[PDB]
């Protein structure tokens, strides 16, 4: 599990309201969050599927 998969989700300072996905390692699940459209961190994906493939590979 890459270390970045343990980051809390990071909205950033942007004013957009974009639906993105992060890997919630405690929950064992990819979950939606609101991304502001700028200053993304790595635990930020287009889909649940993308998040799982990077962070819950098995």
Author numbering: 1001 to 1058
Paper text:
Here, we report a structural and thermodynamic analysis of six extensively simplified BPTI variants, where 19–24 of its 58 residues are alanines, using differential scanning calorimetry (DSC) and X-ray crystallography. We used a stabilized BPTI- (BPTI- A14GA38V12), containing only the 5–55 disulfide bond, as the reference molecule instead of wild-type BPTI, which contains three disulfide bonds13, and a BPTI variant containing 19 alanines (BPTI-19A) as the template for further simplification. However, the alanine substitutions exerted a small unexpected enthalpy stabilization, and the magnitude of which increased in a nearly additive fashion along with the number of alanine substitutions, which was, however, over-compensated with entropy destabilization. A structural analysis indicated that new water molecules were recruited into the spaces created by the alanine substitutions, facilitating protein–water hydrogen-bonded interactions as well as interactions with the methyl group and creating hydration networks around the substitution sites.
We mutated the exposed and partially exposed residues (P8, K15, R17, R39, K41, R42, and D50) to alanines because we expected that these substitutions would minimally affect the densely packed interior of the native protein45. The mutants were named according to the numbers of alanines in their sequences (i.e. BPTI-19A stands for a BPTI variant containing 19 Alanines) and a suffix ‘a’ or ‘b’ was added to distinguish variants containing the same numbers of alanines at different sites45. To provide a structural view of this peculiar instance of enthalpy stabilization, we crystallized and solved the structures of six simplified BPTI variants containing 19, 20, 21, 22, 23, and 24 alanines. On the other hand, despite repeated trials, BPTI variants containing 25–27 alanines merely formed needle crystals, unsuitable for diffraction. All six variants crystallized under the same conditions, indicating a minimal disturbance of the surface properties, even upon multiple alanine substitutions. Seven novel water molecules appeared near residues 10–14 and the Gly14/Val38 pair, forming an elongated hydration network involving water molecules hydrogen-bonded to the backbone atoms of the protein. The R39A substitution also recruited 1–2 new water molecules close to the amide nitrogen of Ala39, extending the hydration networks observed in BPTI-21A. X-ray crystallographic analyses indicated that all of the simplified BPTI structures fully overlapped and that the main change that occurred upon the number of alanines was an increase in the solvent content in the asymmetric units. The new water molecules were recruited around the alanine substitution sites and were involved in novel hydration networks.
